[model samples]
Target: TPDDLININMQLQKADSAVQEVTGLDIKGICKALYGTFSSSEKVGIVPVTSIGNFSASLHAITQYFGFDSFVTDMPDVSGYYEAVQNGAEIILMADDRTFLAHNLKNGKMANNQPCTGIIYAEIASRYLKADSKDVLVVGLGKVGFPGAEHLVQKDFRVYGYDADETLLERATSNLGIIPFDPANPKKFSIIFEATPCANTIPEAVLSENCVLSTPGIPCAISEELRDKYEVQLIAEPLGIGTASMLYSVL
Candidate 1:
């Protein structure tokens, strides 16, 4: 449901109370006294962020669970981002790179067969170029497909976008000049990064040697086992299956 905290930490409580009704000591108070002086009220560090958009919600979900001091910054442009990168700041190593999972929870025409995504494709491609491939083959015509195509192009990836929506196809082409893909020849790409969030995701041909496959949603675009026993690789998926089996881990 959220970003998992795998790091280990321990808090020491001063033995003040008994073992019966009054047991544990004030852990926060003890910590404050040991490190620095105590203040009046203590903040529990619980941040609440409720967003409607995929990007906003996903970003908030991640920041809430793991941030030291959580806050939001909306950038019209990114001179600051470029400066940080130029200055020997490498977040790809220090950061637990965000991965995306977007799909329908139930079965229906509106929910199923339709790629109504929960996570944003921008977040997915942002990390992929850093740690993996650049070529993205996003399947869909709705919001999922459109945003992914845009972001991929922005990232300088040769994007081949697909969608069954005739109206959406027209909009994508005219509005953004997005490249179209024939379902019959859905490009032989390095990574099959599907934007189609439908549980019944269209299965594409396996990418042969030197290629990798990745999807932003679950019940993958391909068949897969649900554990480490089966060799799999993914940029972002909490579930155990349908990752890139580059033959990196298993045979």
Candidate 2:
């Protein structure tokens, strides 16, 4: 099975590289943007979706990109976590498609965040939009949306937030300092970050001309129809290099 992981990882790398090659994005810029800064002071460990070699290899590549002394193994179970801790992993991460596993890693002894996709997307958005000079709206309040909102606020961007869950909206408002999003007209934001993990999270929503939309969510949160119609600039995929720098906080 681990051998199989290698083949899959090879394919994954090819796909990821092709996108970067076609787009002509700078790897260093992406890494720096995601990290804001990088330090080589920590060692981190990650338990992938499985103990298979593909994810383990992927984790190793991602961690090394940020200068972290890192280890990865095929482990999603409790035992795998324990082994990581025993092996001197100061921070243990569950690296998968999302933050659900990252959330569960919190018994509090270790620091962790699962919004790598969210974090990277917002950082990339800042490059395209003058966030400090404009209003930005982040859709959804899930693990991804909240962190993206917080990141924008930290960058001194005016961040407004909306979620289908009212409780989440209240919670995010306090934690992220997000202003309540006005749904009667959602087109106000010059920058829109959609973190919902599905298509069309913004049904009937409108975007300003020249709006930049960053979608780190799977299936892409915005429709191409709207993007073409409004001439909205879309950052639809997570940058592999940008995401690699996300673990810079840990070894």
Candidate 3:
């Protein structure tokens, strides 16, 4: 398996030497800018808000692969994070954006879902081209939901959004230019973006053949039975993938 990386490492080593034969910047700085946050030696701490299982272990593995001393600490909640960090955790990974605000974590970013998920959502829609119209339906409109809708709007898709919170619905329309959906008898949309963390967010009412559901939420919206019955295309960055991706983006 190590031999498999011989060519891959060769290319990385080559690229590390120079970019377009132009060399001046510090190699570490250049690599950080071009790729993402990386450290040769530093202890990294992951603080999961909810729970940890295979989902969390995979994240730790990803960080280790990137050459960091990574480990998961059970903070269950962010309350004791400040105390925990002093135990040699230079980098903290958290799912709740609120934690970033709490301790003023200069190095923290969204551990799970983020704005980039929107771009991924849009790309999936472009591939299938199943929606009757450019209009997209986004469920649970805040944080990940609204940001994803904004990306769809930028891609020239008319985004119709919904949220249980009326305030979020108001903001989505007034600020983001998302057309608010009338929930009573919502039209079938081919491209749907679901950002709900709730287990039951995917209602049977929204089912349609060839419909594509794009999501990055943990405890994601749709189920296997629903997906199979409706022949839905589920485009997602699963927990393991998103965790590693966000670490690369943030740290």
Candidate 4:
């Protein structure tokens, strides 16, 4: 899990260029559109959960990089929350094994990491593609994929969803009015949103020319060979974009 967060700050530094290359939009502009403008003066507290490994320092660094005033707790867990409050934190960020959350103390606004990651990546895919058809493929209809497909459908794109579990795929289809991806009669797509934890989720057959892929998938759905062959524009990072989205969402 720590490897997933390695070089996170460096990845964040390059995030703007990566996003701009594919979506023609920078991170700040995208976040401003999705959420409101974030105030630099807001004091953020990062609480380390010792139940998990220490990552509060990294989160604190990211917060300051985003131009916010931030501090990590000297102690972890519940004690950290008290320290955060004492330090005048307007927002608190913490995560357990199950959930990562950003909570705004002043307004009680909250953001979940999964859906935020999904939506932000989906937004990138929607903005990047310039195909005549607005059909976009979303693989892995789980917590991440479902929200992403929902966002794409909300943006008026015809979202085709896929999951290994037929039940999950059916749920997304019924709930979001998304079409189930038919591998037997697959349609080529210029844009794809991948939220799976698995590797190589995007097949070569499904990609159109110069396909743009926006994936928050850890291993990345598109392979190096596919990228070279298609000249794909990929927008991906482990944590920066999603964390940034969460911060902005609750700002």
Clashing pairs in 1: none
RMSD of 3: 9.8
Worst 10 residues of 3 by lDDT: 18-27
lDDT of 2: 0.63
TM per model? 0.43, 0.66, 0.58, 0.94
Off-target runs (Cα >4 Å) in candidate 3 are 1-56, 64-97, 100-113, 116-133, 218-220, 236-238, 248-251
Model 4: colliding residue pairs: none
From the highest TM-score down, the ranking of the candidates is 4, 2, 3, 1
Candidate 1 lDDT over residue span 156-208, tens digit each: 76666666677777776776666776766655555555655555454434343
lDDT of 3 by residue, 59-142 (tens): 565556557687777545565365448667766665554432111145554343455444444444433444566767888776
Which residues of candidate 1, in runs, are more than 4 Å off? 1-65, 70-135, 200-202, 225-232, 238-251
Cα misplacement distance, residue 100 of candidate 1 (Å): 14
Local lDDT at 212 for model 3 = 76
> Residue 174 in model 1: shift from native, Å?
2.3
Measured by lDDT, the strongest candidate is: 4
lDDT of 2 at 162: 85
- Tens digit of per-residue lDDT, candidate 2, span 110-215: 2234466677667666555333345778888787778878888888888888888899999999887789887875555667888876788765465766677777
C-alpha RMSD for every candidate: 18.6, 5.6, 9.8, 2.5
10 residues in a row with least lDDT, candidate 1: 242-251
lDDT (tens digit, per residue) of candidate 4 on 124-229: 8898835557889999889888999999999999999999999999899889999899888888999889999999889889988788888989898988999999
